[PDB]
Design a protein around this ligand. Structure first.
Ligand code: NA
Ligand code: NA
Ligand SMILES: [Zn+2]
Ligand SMILES: [Zn+2]
Lengths: 25, 26
């Protein structure tokens, strides 16, 4: 399922969002 | 044809699509 990152706006699998926010911020 | 595992979500998918599947920081 895809979610939008609340910061950079990229669409990505929900299972990545936490990890993404942790790495990019 | 080749499956590789996603290092973030541990799902299997074709190697051709793993690049698209992961997102980078902008
Ligand atoms: Na994406
Ligand atoms: Na961080
Ligand atoms: Zn982001
Ligand atoms: Zn994944």
């Amino acid at each position: 399922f895809q979610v939008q990152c609340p910061v950079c706006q990229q669409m990505m699998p929900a299972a990545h969002i936490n990890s993404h926010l942790d790495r990019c911020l």
